[PDB]
């Protein structure tokens, strides 16, 4: 007989850092979270390949 294993995981972004963070050099009108989620979206794909 043979039966598989399960593994999953999650990540959440709260309300402050969605609208409060920009770049560190210039002034930004709040669009860096869309940059930062898409990396974190790519990172969880690397988690499952690592597992």
């Amino acid at each position: 007989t043979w039966s598989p294993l399960a593994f999953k995981e999650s990540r959440v972004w709260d309300e402050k850092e969605i609208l409060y963070l920009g770049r560190l050099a210039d002034e930004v009108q709040a669009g860096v979270i869309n940059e930062q989620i898409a990396e974190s979206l790519t990172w969880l794909m690397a988690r499952m390949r690592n597992r």
Binding site: E15, I18, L19, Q29, A30, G31, I33, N34
Partner: protein, 51 residues
């Protein structure tokens, strides 16, 4: 509004004295990216299917 024994004294001009600034808040999403808006907002929550 102006109290009874009081008056204001406007100095060198009678134009717009200052500025009122609306800043950004969080709206919904468009293509998985967080969308932002300024000024007042009105959010609608139709939970017309709950128990």
């Amino acid at each position: 509004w102006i109290p009874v024994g009081e008056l204001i004294v406007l100095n060198q001009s009678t134009g717009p004295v200052g500025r009122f600034v609306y800043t950004a808040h969080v709206a919904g999403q468009r293509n998985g990216k967080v969308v932002y808006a300024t000024g007042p907002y009105l959010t609608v929550k139709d939970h017309l299917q709950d128990d």
